[PDB]
Coordinates of C-alpha atoms in Angstrom, one line a residue:
Chain A
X1 CA 29.8 17.2 -14.4
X2 CA 33.3 17.5 -12.9
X3 CA 33.4 21.1 -14.1
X4 CA 32.8 19.9 -17.7
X5 CA 30.0 21.7 -19.6
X6 CA 30.7 24.9 -17.7
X7 CA 27.7 27.3 -17.9
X8 CA 26.4 30.4 -16.3
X9 CA 23.3 32.5 -15.8
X10 CA 22.4 36.0 -17.0
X11 CA 22.4 38.9 -14.6
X12 CA 18.9 40.5 -14.3
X13 CA 15.9 40.6 -12.0
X14 CA 14.1 37.4 -11.5
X15 CA 11.2 38.4 -9.3
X16 CA 9.0 35.4 -8.3
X17 CA 10.9 32.2 -9.1
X18 CA 10.6 29.1 -6.9
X19 CA 12.5 25.8 -7.6
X20 CA 11.9 23.3 -4.7
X21 CA 14.4 20.8 -6.0
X22 CA 16.7 20.0 -3.1
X23 CA 17.1 18.1 0.1
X24 CA 19.7 17.5 2.8
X25 CA 22.0 14.5 2.9
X26 CA 20.0 13.0 5.8
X27 CA 17.0 12.9 3.5
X28 CA 19.1 11.2 0.8
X29 CA 20.7 8.9 3.4
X30 CA 17.2 8.0 4.7
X31 CA 15.8 7.4 1.3
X32 CA 18.8 5.2 0.3
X33 CA 18.3 3.1 3.4
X34 CA 14.6 2.9 2.8
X35 CA 15.3 1.8 -0.8
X36 CA 17.5 -1.0 0.5
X37 CA 14.7 -2.2 2.7
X38 CA 12.2 -2.7 -0.1
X39 CA 14.1 -5.3 -2.0
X40 CA 14.9 -9.0 -1.9
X41 CA 18.5 -9.0 -0.8
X42 CA 19.4 -11.7 -3.2
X43 CA 20.9 -11.1 -6.7
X44 CA 17.6 -9.8 -7.9
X45 CA 18.2 -6.5 -6.2
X46 CA 21.7 -5.9 -7.5
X47 CA 21.4 -7.0 -11.1
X48 CA 19.3 -4.0 -12.4
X49 CA 21.7 -1.5 -10.8
Chain B
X1 CA 35.9 0.3 1.9
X2 CA 38.2 -1.8 -0.3
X3 CA 40.5 -3.8 2.0
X4 CA 43.6 -5.3 0.6
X5 CA 45.3 -8.4 1.9
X6 CA 44.6 -7.5 5.5
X7 CA 43.1 -10.6 7.0
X8 CA 41.6 -8.9 10.1
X9 CA 40.0 -6.3 7.9
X10 CA 38.1 -8.6 5.5
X11 CA 34.5 -7.4 5.4
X12 CA 32.4 -10.5 5.8
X13 CA 28.9 -9.0 6.0
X14 CA 27.0 -5.9 5.2
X15 CA 24.1 -5.5 7.5
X16 CA 20.9 -3.5 7.8
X17 CA 18.2 -3.5 10.6
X18 CA 14.5 -2.6 10.4
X19 CA 14.0 -2.4 14.2
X20 CA 15.8 -1.1 17.2
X21 CA 17.5 -4.0 19.0
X22 CA 17.6 -2.1 22.3
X23 CA 13.8 -2.5 22.4
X24 CA 14.1 -6.2 22.0
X25 CA 16.8 -6.3 24.6
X26 CA 19.3 -7.6 22.0
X27 CA 21.8 -4.9 22.9
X28 CA 24.6 -7.3 23.8
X29 CA 24.1 -9.8 20.9
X30 CA 26.1 -10.6 17.9
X31 CA 25.4 -8.0 15.2
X32 CA 24.6 -10.7 12.7
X33 CA 21.8 -12.0 14.9
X34 CA 20.1 -8.5 14.8
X35 CA 20.6 -7.2 11.3
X36 CA 19.6 -8.5 7.9
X37 CA 22.4 -9.5 5.5
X38 CA 23.0 -8.8 1.8
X39 CA 24.0 -11.8 -0.4
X40 CA 24.6 -11.3 -4.1
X41 CA 27.5 -12.5 -6.3
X42 CA 28.3 -12.4 -10.0
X43 CA 30.4 -15.1 -11.7
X44 CA 32.6 -13.2 -14.2
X45 CA 34.9 -14.9 -16.7
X46 CA 38.7 -14.4 -16.6
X47 CA 39.1 -14.8 -20.3
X48 CA 37.0 -11.8 -21.3
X49 CA 38.8 -9.7 -18.6
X50 CA 42.2 -10.7 -20.0
Chain C
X1 CA -0.2 -31.7 45.8
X2 CA -4.0 -31.3 45.6
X3 CA -5.5 -28.5 43.5
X4 CA -2.1 -27.9 41.8
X5 CA -0.5 -28.5 38.4
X6 CA 3.0 -28.4 37.2
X7 CA 4.2 -26.7 34.0
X8 CA 7.4 -27.0 31.9
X9 CA 7.7 -23.2 31.5
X10 CA 7.6 -20.3 34.0
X11 CA 4.2 -18.7 34.2
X12 CA 3.0 -15.2 35.2
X13 CA -0.3 -13.4 35.4
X14 CA -1.7 -11.7 32.3
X15 CA -0.2 -8.2 31.8
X16 CA -1.1 -5.4 29.4
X17 CA -0.1 -6.5 25.9
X18 CA 2.6 -3.9 25.5
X19 CA 6.0 -4.3 23.8
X20 CA 8.1 -5.5 26.8
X21 CA 6.2 -8.7 27.6
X22 CA 6.1 -9.4 23.9
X23 CA 9.9 -10.1 23.8
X24 CA 11.0 -10.9 27.3
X25 CA 9.4 -14.3 27.6
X26 CA 11.6 -17.3 28.4
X27 CA 10.6 -19.1 25.2
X28 CA 11.6 -16.0 23.2
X29 CA 14.9 -16.1 25.0
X30 CA 15.4 -19.8 24.1
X31 CA 14.7 -19.0 20.5
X32 CA 17.0 -16.0 20.4
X33 CA 20.0 -17.6 22.0
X34 CA 19.6 -20.8 19.9
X35 CA 19.5 -19.1 16.6
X36 CA 22.4 -16.9 17.7
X37 CA 24.3 -20.0 18.5
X38 CA 23.7 -21.7 15.1
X39 CA 24.7 -18.6 13.3
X40 CA 28.3 -18.8 14.6
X41 CA 28.1 -22.5 13.8
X42 CA 27.4 -22.1 10.1
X43 CA 30.0 -19.3 10.0
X44 CA 32.6 -21.6 11.5
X45 CA 35.7 -22.4 9.5
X46 CA 34.8 -26.0 9.2
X47 CA 31.9 -25.5 6.9
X48 CA 34.2 -24.4 4.0
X49 CA 34.0 -27.8 2.3
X50 CA 30.4 -27.0 1.2
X51 CA 29.6 -23.4 2.1
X52 CA 31.1 -20.8 -0.1
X53 CA 30.8 -17.1 0.8
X54 CA 27.5 -16.6 -1.1
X55 CA 25.9 -19.6 0.6
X56 CA 27.3 -18.6 3.9
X57 CA 25.6 -15.2 3.7
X58 CA 22.5 -16.8 2.3
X59 CA 22.2 -19.2 5.2
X60 CA 23.0 -16.4 7.6
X61 CA 20.2 -14.2 6.2
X62 CA 17.7 -17.0 6.6
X63 CA 18.5 -17.7 10.2
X64 CA 18.5 -14.0 11.2
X65 CA 15.2 -13.6 9.4
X66 CA 13.7 -16.5 11.4
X67 CA 15.0 -14.8 14.6
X68 CA 13.6 -11.3 13.8
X69 CA 10.0 -12.1 12.8
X70 CA 7.4 -11.3 15.5
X71 CA 5.4 -14.1 17.0
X72 CA 3.0 -14.0 19.9
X73 CA 3.4 -17.8 20.7
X74 CA 6.0 -17.3 23.5
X75 CA 3.7 -14.7 25.1
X76 CA 0.8 -17.0 24.9
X77 CA 2.7 -19.8 26.5
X78 CA 4.0 -17.7 29.4
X79 CA 0.9 -15.7 30.2
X80 CA -2.3 -17.1 28.6
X81 CA -1.9 -20.9 28.1
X82 CA -1.8 -21.7 31.8
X83 CA -5.1 -20.1 32.3
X84 CA -6.7 -22.2 29.6
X85 CA -5.2 -25.4 31.0
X86 CA -6.4 -24.6 34.5
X87 CA -10.0 -24.1 33.5
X88 CA -10.1 -27.0 31.1
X89 CA -8.8 -29.4 33.7
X90 CA -11.7 -28.5 35.9
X91 CA -14.3 -29.7 33.4
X92 CA -12.7 -32.6 31.5
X93 CA -14.1 -36.0 32.6
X94 CA -10.6 -37.4 33.1
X95 CA -8.6 -35.3 35.6
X96 CA -5.0 -34.5 34.8
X97 CA -2.4 -37.2 35.5
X98 CA 1.1 -35.7 36.1
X99 CA 4.6 -36.4 37.4
Chain D
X1 CA 4.7 9.7 15.7
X2 CA 1.2 8.3 15.1
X3 CA 2.2 4.8 16.1
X4 CA 4.0 6.0 19.2
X5 CA 1.1 8.1 20.4
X6 CA -1.3 5.2 20.4
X7 CA 1.2 3.3 22.5
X8 CA 2.0 4.2 26.1
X9 CA 5.1 6.5 26.3
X10 CA 6.6 5.0 23.1
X11 CA 9.8 6.5 21.9
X12 CA 10.2 10.2 22.8
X13 CA 7.2 11.9 21.2
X14 CA 4.9 14.5 22.8
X15 CA 1.5 13.1 23.8
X16 CA -1.2 15.9 23.7
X17 CA -4.1 13.5 23.1
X18 CA -3.1 11.2 26.0
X19 CA -6.4 11.9 27.8
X20 CA -8.3 9.9 25.2
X21 CA -8.7 6.2 25.7
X22 CA -6.9 3.6 23.6
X23 CA -7.2 0.1 24.9
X24 CA -5.6 -2.1 22.2
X25 CA -1.9 -1.6 21.7
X26 CA -1.1 -4.9 19.9
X27 CA 1.3 -5.0 17.0
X28 CA -1.7 -5.7 14.7
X29 CA -3.1 -2.3 15.6
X30 CA 0.2 -0.6 14.9
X31 CA 0.5 -2.2 11.5
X32 CA -3.0 -1.0 10.6
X33 CA -2.2 2.5 11.7
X34 CA 1.1 2.5 9.7
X35 CA -0.8 1.3 6.6
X36 CA -3.4 4.1 7.1
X37 CA -0.7 6.7 7.2
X38 CA 1.2 5.2 4.3
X39 CA -2.0 5.2 2.2
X40 CA -2.8 8.7 3.2
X41 CA 0.5 10.1 2.1
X42 CA 0.5 8.2 -1.2
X43 CA -3.0 9.6 -1.9
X44 CA -2.2 13.2 -0.8
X45 CA 0.9 13.6 -2.9
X46 CA 0.0 11.1 -5.6
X47 CA 3.1 8.9 -5.1
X48 CA 3.6 5.9 -7.3
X49 CA 6.3 3.5 -6.1
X50 CA 6.7 1.7 -2.8
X51 CA 6.9 4.2 0.1
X52 CA 7.4 3.4 3.8
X53 CA 6.7 -0.3 2.9
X54 CA 8.9 -3.1 4.1
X55 CA 9.0 -1.7 7.6
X56 CA 6.2 -4.1 8.5
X57 CA 8.2 -7.0 7.0
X58 CA 8.6 -8.5 10.4
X59 CA 5.2 -7.2 11.4
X60 CA 5.8 -5.0 14.4
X61 CA 6.1 -1.3 13.6
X62 CA 6.2 -0.4 17.3
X63 CA 10.0 -0.8 17.3
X64 CA 10.7 0.3 13.8
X65 CA 14.1 2.0 13.4
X66 CA 16.7 2.1 10.6
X67 CA 20.4 1.3 11.0
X68 CA 23.2 -0.1 8.9
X69 CA 26.5 -1.8 9.6
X70 CA 29.2 -4.0 8.3
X71 CA 31.5 -6.5 10.1
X72 CA 35.1 -7.4 9.7
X73 CA 36.8 -10.7 10.4
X74 CA 38.9 -9.0 13.1
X75 CA 35.7 -8.5 15.1
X76 CA 35.4 -4.8 14.5
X77 CA 32.0 -3.2 13.8
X78 CA 30.8 0.1 12.4
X79 CA 27.1 0.4 13.3
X80 CA 26.1 3.5 11.4
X81 CA 22.8 5.1 12.6
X82 CA 20.3 6.8 10.3
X83 CA 18.0 9.1 12.3
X84 CA 15.5 11.3 10.5
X85 CA 16.0 15.0 10.1
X86 CA 13.8 17.8 11.3
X87 CA 10.3 17.8 9.8
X88 CA 7.7 20.5 9.4
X89 CA 4.4 18.5 9.1
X90 CA 5.2 16.6 12.3
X91 CA 5.5 19.9 14.2
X92 CA 2.3 21.2 12.5
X93 CA 0.4 18.1 13.5
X94 CA 1.2 18.8 17.2
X95 CA -0.4 22.2 17.0
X96 CA -3.5 20.7 15.4
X97 CA -3.7 18.1 18.2
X98 CA -3.2 20.7 20.9
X99 CA -5.9 22.9 19.4
Chain E
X1 CA 6.3 -23.3 12.5
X2 CA 3.7 -22.9 15.2
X3 CA 6.4 -21.5 17.5
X4 CA 7.3 -18.8 14.9
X5 CA 3.9 -17.8 13.5
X6 CA 1.7 -16.6 16.4
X7 CA -0.6 -14.0 14.9
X8 CA -3.4 -12.7 17.1
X9 CA -6.7 -11.0 16.4
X10 CA -7.2 -7.2 16.1
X11 CA -9.6 -6.3 18.8
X12 CA -8.6 -8.8 21.4
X13 CA -10.1 -8.3 24.9
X14 CA -9.0 -11.3 27.0
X15 CA -11.9 -10.9 29.4
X16 CA -14.6 -10.9 26.7
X17 CA -13.0 -13.7 24.6
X18 CA -12.4 -16.0 27.6
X19 CA -15.8 -15.5 29.1
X20 CA -17.5 -16.1 25.8
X21 CA -15.5 -19.2 25.1
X22 CA -15.7 -20.7 28.6
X23 CA -19.4 -20.2 29.1
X24 CA -20.5 -23.2 27.0
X25 CA -18.1 -25.5 28.8
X26 CA -20.0 -25.2 32.1
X27 CA -23.3 -26.3 30.4
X28 CA -22.2 -29.9 30.8
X29 CA -23.0 -32.3 33.5
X30 CA -20.1 -34.7 32.9
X31 CA -18.3 -33.3 35.9
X32 CA -20.9 -34.7 38.2
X33 CA -21.4 -38.0 36.5
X34 CA -17.7 -38.5 36.9
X35 CA -18.1 -38.2 40.7
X36 CA -21.0 -40.6 40.8
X37 CA -19.2 -43.2 38.8
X38 CA -16.1 -42.9 41.0
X39 CA -18.3 -43.5 44.1
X40 CA -19.7 -46.6 42.6
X41 CA -16.2 -47.7 41.7
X42 CA -15.2 -47.5 45.3
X43 CA -18.1 -49.6 46.6
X44 CA -17.6 -52.2 43.9
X45 CA -13.9 -52.3 44.7
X46 CA -14.3 -52.7 48.5
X47 CA -16.9 -55.4 48.2
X48 CA -14.9 -57.3 45.5
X49 CA -11.8 -57.1 47.7
Chain F
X1 CA -14.2 4.5 11.7
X2 CA -10.8 4.7 10.0
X3 CA -9.3 1.8 11.9
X4 CA -10.2 -1.1 14.3
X5 CA -13.8 -0.8 13.4
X6 CA -14.8 -2.4 10.1
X7 CA -15.6 -6.0 10.9
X8 CA -16.1 -5.4 14.6
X9 CA -18.7 -2.8 15.4
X10 CA -22.2 -2.1 14.1
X11 CA -22.8 0.6 11.5
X12 CA -24.6 2.7 14.1
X13 CA -22.0 2.4 16.9
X14 CA -18.5 3.8 17.4
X15 CA -15.7 2.1 19.2
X16 CA -15.1 3.9 22.5
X17 CA -12.0 1.9 23.2
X18 CA -10.1 2.9 20.0
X19 CA -11.1 6.6 20.1
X20 CA -7.6 8.2 20.4
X21 CA -6.3 6.4 17.3
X22 CA -9.3 7.2 15.1
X23 CA -9.3 10.8 16.3
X24 CA -5.6 11.2 15.5
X25 CA -6.0 9.7 12.0
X26 CA -8.9 12.0 11.2
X27 CA -6.8 15.0 12.2
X28 CA -4.0 13.8 10.0
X29 CA -6.3 13.8 7.0
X30 CA -7.4 17.3 8.0
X31 CA -3.8 18.4 8.0
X32 CA -2.9 16.9 4.6
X33 CA -6.0 18.3 2.9
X34 CA -4.9 21.8 3.6
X35 CA -1.3 21.6 2.3
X36 CA -1.8 24.3 -0.4
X37 CA -0.6 27.7 -1.4
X38 CA -2.7 30.9 -0.9
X39 CA -2.2 32.4 -4.4
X40 CA -3.3 35.9 -4.9
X41 CA -6.1 37.1 -7.2
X42 CA -7.6 40.2 -8.8
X43 CA -8.1 43.2 -6.5
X44 CA -10.4 46.1 -7.5
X45 CA -11.5 49.3 -5.8
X46 CA -15.1 49.5 -4.7
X47 CA -17.0 52.3 -6.5
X48 CA -20.2 51.8 -4.6
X49 CA -21.6 53.6 -1.5
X50 CA -20.8 50.7 0.8
Chain G
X1 CA -6.6 -36.6 -29.4
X2 CA -7.3 -32.9 -28.9
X3 CA -10.5 -33.5 -27.0
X4 CA -8.6 -34.1 -23.8
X5 CA -7.9 -31.6 -21.1
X6 CA -5.7 -32.2 -18.0
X7 CA -7.4 -32.7 -14.7
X8 CA -5.7 -30.8 -11.9
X9 CA -6.2 -32.2 -8.4
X10 CA -5.3 -28.9 -6.6
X11 CA -5.8 -25.8 -8.8
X12 CA -4.0 -22.6 -8.0
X13 CA -6.7 -20.5 -6.1
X14 CA -7.6 -17.2 -7.8
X15 CA -6.5 -15.3 -4.6
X16 CA -2.9 -16.5 -5.2
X17 CA -2.3 -13.8 -7.9
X18 CA -1.4 -10.2 -7.7
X19 CA -3.1 -7.4 -9.7
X20 CA -2.8 -7.5 -13.4
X21 CA 0.0 -6.0 -15.4
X22 CA -2.2 -5.6 -18.5
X23 CA -2.3 -9.2 -19.2
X24 CA -0.2 -11.2 -16.8
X25 CA -0.4 -11.7 -13.0
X26 CA 2.6 -12.2 -10.8
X27 CA 2.6 -15.0 -8.2
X28 CA 2.2 -14.0 -4.5
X29 CA 5.3 -14.8 -2.4
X30 CA 3.2 -16.6 0.2
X31 CA 2.4 -19.4 -2.2
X32 CA 4.5 -22.5 -1.9
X33 CA 4.5 -26.0 -3.4
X34 CA 5.6 -27.3 -6.8
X35 CA 4.1 -24.2 -8.6
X36 CA 6.4 -22.0 -6.5
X37 CA 9.3 -24.1 -7.5
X38 CA 8.3 -23.9 -11.2
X39 CA 7.8 -20.2 -11.0
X40 CA 11.2 -19.5 -9.4
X41 CA 13.0 -21.7 -11.9
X42 CA 11.6 -20.0 -15.0
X43 CA 12.0 -16.6 -13.4
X44 CA 15.7 -17.3 -12.6
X45 CA 16.3 -18.4 -16.2
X46 CA 14.5 -15.3 -17.5
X47 CA 16.8 -13.1 -15.4
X48 CA 19.9 -14.8 -16.9
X49 CA 18.4 -14.3 -20.4
Chain H
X1 CA -4.6 -36.1 24.4
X2 CA -6.7 -35.8 21.3
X3 CA -9.8 -34.6 23.1
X4 CA -7.8 -32.1 25.1
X5 CA -6.0 -30.8 22.1
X6 CA -9.2 -30.3 20.2
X7 CA -10.7 -28.4 23.1
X8 CA -7.6 -26.2 23.3
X9 CA -7.7 -25.4 19.6
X10 CA -11.4 -24.7 19.9
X11 CA -11.0 -22.3 22.8
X12 CA -7.8 -20.4 22.4
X13 CA -7.6 -16.9 20.9
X14 CA -4.2 -17.7 19.3
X15 CA -4.1 -17.8 15.5
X16 CA -1.5 -19.7 13.6
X17 CA -0.6 -18.1 10.2
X18 CA 2.7 -18.8 8.4
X19 CA 2.3 -15.8 6.1
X20 CA 4.7 -13.1 7.4
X21 CA 7.3 -15.9 8.0
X22 CA 7.1 -17.0 4.4
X23 CA 7.3 -13.4 3.1
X24 CA 10.4 -12.8 5.2
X25 CA 12.2 -16.0 4.1
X26 CA 11.3 -15.6 0.4
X27 CA 13.2 -12.3 0.3
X28 CA 16.3 -14.4 0.7
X29 CA 15.8 -17.8 -0.8
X30 CA 14.9 -18.9 -4.3
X31 CA 13.8 -22.3 -5.5
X32 CA 16.2 -22.9 -8.3
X33 CA 18.2 -25.9 -9.5
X34 CA 21.2 -24.1 -8.1
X35 CA 20.9 -23.4 -4.4
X36 CA 18.3 -26.1 -3.7
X37 CA 20.2 -28.6 -1.5
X38 CA 21.2 -25.8 0.9
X39 CA 17.5 -24.8 1.2
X40 CA 15.7 -28.1 0.7
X41 CA 14.8 -28.4 4.4
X42 CA 13.6 -24.8 4.4
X43 CA 11.2 -25.6 1.6
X44 CA 10.0 -28.7 3.5
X45 CA 9.4 -26.4 6.5
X46 CA 7.4 -23.8 4.5
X47 CA 5.5 -26.5 2.7
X48 CA 1.8 -26.2 3.5
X49 CA 1.1 -29.1 5.9
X50 CA -2.7 -28.4 5.9
Chain I
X1 CA -5.3 -0.9 -5.7
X2 CA -4.5 2.4 -4.1
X3 CA -1.8 3.6 -6.5
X4 CA -2.3 2.2 -10.0
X5 CA -0.3 3.7 -12.8
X6 CA 1.4 2.9 -16.2
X7 CA 5.1 2.3 -16.8
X8 CA 7.2 1.3 -19.8
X9 CA 8.1 -2.3 -20.4
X10 CA 10.9 -3.7 -22.6
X11 CA 10.2 -5.4 -25.9
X12 CA 10.8 -8.8 -24.4
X13 CA 7.9 -8.2 -22.0
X14 CA 5.7 -6.9 -24.8
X15 CA 6.3 -10.3 -26.5
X16 CA 5.2 -12.0 -23.4
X17 CA 2.1 -9.8 -23.2
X18 CA 1.0 -11.0 -26.6
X19 CA 2.3 -14.5 -26.1
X20 CA 0.2 -15.0 -22.9
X21 CA -2.8 -13.5 -24.7
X22 CA -2.4 -16.1 -27.5
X23 CA -1.9 -19.0 -25.1
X24 CA -5.0 -18.0 -23.1
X25 CA -7.0 -17.7 -26.3
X26 CA -5.8 -21.2 -27.2
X27 CA -4.5 -22.4 -30.6
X28 CA -7.0 -22.3 -33.4
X29 CA -6.4 -25.1 -35.9
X30 CA -8.1 -25.8 -39.2
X31 CA -8.4 -29.3 -40.5
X32 CA -8.7 -30.1 -44.2
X33 CA -8.3 -33.8 -44.5
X34 CA -8.2 -35.1 -48.0
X35 CA -9.1 -38.8 -47.3
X36 CA -12.5 -37.7 -46.0
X37 CA -15.0 -35.9 -48.3
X38 CA -15.9 -32.3 -48.1
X39 CA -15.6 -31.9 -44.4
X40 CA -13.1 -29.1 -43.6
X41 CA -13.6 -27.1 -40.4
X42 CA -11.8 -25.3 -37.6
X43 CA -11.9 -25.7 -33.9
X44 CA -9.6 -24.4 -31.1
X45 CA -7.7 -26.4 -28.5
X46 CA -5.2 -25.9 -25.7
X47 CA -3.0 -28.7 -27.1
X48 CA 0.5 -27.4 -27.6
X49 CA 1.7 -27.5 -31.3
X50 CA 4.6 -29.9 -30.7
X51 CA 5.1 -30.5 -34.4
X52 CA 8.9 -30.8 -34.4
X53 CA 12.1 -30.7 -32.2
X54 CA 11.3 -27.0 -31.3
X55 CA 8.9 -28.3 -28.7
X56 CA 11.2 -30.7 -27.0
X57 CA 13.0 -27.9 -25.2
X58 CA 9.9 -26.6 -23.3
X59 CA 8.6 -30.1 -22.4
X60 CA 12.1 -31.3 -21.3
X61 CA 12.6 -28.2 -19.2
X62 CA 9.2 -28.6 -17.4
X63 CA 9.9 -32.4 -17.2
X64 CA 13.2 -31.8 -15.4
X65 CA 11.8 -29.2 -13.1
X66 CA 8.8 -31.2 -11.7
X67 CA 11.0 -34.3 -11.3
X68 CA 13.6 -32.3 -9.3
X69 CA 11.0 -30.9 -7.0
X70 CA 9.5 -34.3 -6.5
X71 CA 12.8 -35.8 -5.5
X72 CA 14.1 -33.1 -3.2
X73 CA 10.9 -31.9 -1.6
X74 CA 7.6 -33.8 -2.1
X75 CA 8.9 -37.4 -1.8
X76 CA 10.9 -37.0 1.5
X77 CA 8.0 -35.2 3.1
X78 CA 5.5 -37.8 2.1
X79 CA 7.1 -41.3 1.9
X80 CA 7.0 -43.7 4.8
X81 CA 9.8 -46.2 4.6
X82 CA 12.8 -45.0 6.6
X83 CA 15.1 -47.0 4.4
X84 CA 13.6 -45.4 1.3
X85 CA 14.1 -42.0 2.8
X86 CA 17.7 -42.9 3.5
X87 CA 18.3 -43.9 -0.1
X88 CA 16.0 -41.3 -1.6
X89 CA 18.1 -38.6 -0.1
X90 CA 21.6 -37.9 -1.5
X91 CA 20.1 -38.1 -5.0
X92 CA 19.8 -35.4 -7.6
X93 CA 18.6 -35.1 -11.2
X94 CA 22.0 -34.1 -12.6
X95 CA 23.3 -37.6 -11.8
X96 CA 20.1 -39.6 -11.5
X97 CA 17.7 -38.5 -14.2
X98 CA 17.6 -37.8 -17.9
Chain J
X1 CA 42.4 -11.1 -14.1
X2 CA 42.5 -11.3 -10.3
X3 CA 42.6 -7.7 -9.3
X4 CA 39.7 -6.7 -11.5
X5 CA 37.2 -8.5 -9.2
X6 CA 35.9 -7.1 -6.0
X7 CA 36.0 -10.5 -4.1
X8 CA 38.2 -10.1 -1.0
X9 CA 39.2 -13.8 -1.3
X10 CA 40.4 -13.5 -4.9
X11 CA 44.2 -13.3 -4.0
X12 CA 44.1 -16.5 -2.0
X13 CA 42.1 -18.2 -4.8
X14 CA 44.7 -17.1 -7.3
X15 CA 47.5 -18.3 -5.0
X16 CA 46.0 -21.7 -4.4
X17 CA 45.2 -22.1 -8.1
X18 CA 48.9 -22.4 -8.8
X19 CA 49.5 -24.3 -5.5
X20 CA 47.2 -27.1 -6.8
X21 CA 49.4 -27.6 -9.8
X22 CA 52.6 -27.7 -7.8
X23 CA 51.4 -30.0 -5.0
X24 CA 53.7 -32.7 -6.2
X25 CA 57.1 -31.0 -6.4
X26 CA 56.6 -28.1 -4.0
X27 CA 54.5 -28.7 -0.8
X28 CA 53.4 -26.1 1.6
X29 CA 51.4 -26.0 4.8
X30 CA 47.6 -25.5 5.1
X31 CA 46.4 -24.2 8.4
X32 CA 42.9 -25.6 9.1
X33 CA 42.7 -29.4 9.3
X34 CA 40.7 -31.1 6.6
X35 CA 42.1 -29.0 3.8
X36 CA 44.9 -30.1 1.5
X37 CA 47.0 -28.5 -1.2
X38 CA 45.0 -30.3 -3.8
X39 CA 41.7 -28.9 -2.5
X40 CA 39.9 -27.0 -5.3
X41 CA 41.1 -23.5 -5.1
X42 CA 37.6 -22.0 -5.4
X43 CA 36.8 -23.4 -2.0
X44 CA 39.1 -21.0 -0.2
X45 CA 36.4 -18.5 0.6
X46 CA 36.8 -17.8 4.3
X47 CA 39.2 -15.5 6.0
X48 CA 40.2 -18.2 8.5
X49 CA 41.5 -20.6 5.8
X50 CA 44.2 -18.4 4.4

């Protein structure tokens, strides 16, 4: 958010949390390319974006 | 990249390939002959822009 | 000469159907070079009277698509068709007539 | 990996099962294998949208590889490659095959 | 079109397919009748000449 | 009979020439079917003689 | 007047449609001919709308 | 020529199917009143000849 | 078939969903002619309403579309006379058909 | 409104737009043969025609 909506967390024990929510850029780069492969390269692809 | 008035730097094509050209032996060929091309354009109106 | 037949294309025995013979055939070469040539044709400066940028890319995309799609026809011509012609000529009632 | 192993020395993958016979190596077989894998993952993880599709657009997964580039009128090219990152399941599968 | 669409079958064994397809072709006798007719043509030609 | 089998071989047969592919695909399903987490559960002491 | 129904000399085969979207079916890309032309034209106009 | 051609078609393992080709092309073109003359020949090409 | 699911669709598409349902069901008219005697009834038909100028738009659109395809695609692929082909080409609806 | 668009050829199109109106009193040279100062400005969509 470009440092807008600054927020922070409390400071206490969080024993058993797990948040598998992330990936490397290569994953993102790969997915982006894959996304570009599964479209008709005419205007039909661009317009929704 | 946004090029500006540089004739030699005008980007004519954006390309993507589904296969490795080296396997096909296309290693020395024009890139346009080996990669797919995007083609989409939107006809905006100057009057609204102004 | 007797027991012989001529053929417009080069011919070779039937290999394993792996990737290399799929794309190395003379006919495939003819297709690849030809489409490559017409691509720089349509992108020539002279086409501007009719071909705007959008059309130019559109035509380009069509040609490269035609070039990229797999086809076994060139392989069949170079490695399998001569076998079929050879056997058929031996049984048709009218023998081949060639120059 | 799966498509490569059915081929002969395709890409640069390990081949623990190479002792087993696999006669057909045609592109049709590769497409069928890729569809099988694509369906398997979609089922296992309950995916919804298109996944791994479009690679068979030209109909030969045996040489499937991703890359992007753009060209300038001056003749310069960029040719950016997009290789996959390291994977866990792939390494796991090798142990299964070896076992 | 034929040059560009060259699909092939899934379990293609050239030996099996060719042998299966060529076997009926040798059930004919036209090959021999051709020879016989040619021989008669020769004798007719020579005598006519 | 995952692949290369359906319209080609009898129900009672198996395709000896496509064995490596079918074996590989079977193992793949084996792998995917086990992608889970070994969650814990209730432990108790044993008060019996055993 | 209303007892008339048009007679189509080459009906669209049922295998030319995709799976349903609740009521409608999209047209398969592999299908060509005048129907394809009609489909694209209306689709393009729908996009603009 | 006719007899030989019929025999060849009846004996070859080759299969002619313009499906993948149509799919690839249709990802680029569209049959609309605009951009029709540029692609008219392509439509003629892909038209089912029987 | 392997990955069915449900997703939202815009109101326009919802309109189409119902509109297609109606068209497939066919229009259901009810006749109540007064000149005849005690004979009102109802029967459905696929005949488009076409009661006023609001129908001219749809028919004119389809009319133009089929004609354009005929001129540019069907006719050149099918006609025989070379002279006809020569003159049939270089012709388009926007300056040859209304 | 020229700069607001992403088209690389927009500056030339802008320049030729005025050049069309001034073809009578103020002539200039056009490089590629077959193109004239009265050519529709929107056709200048190729880096080689600047």
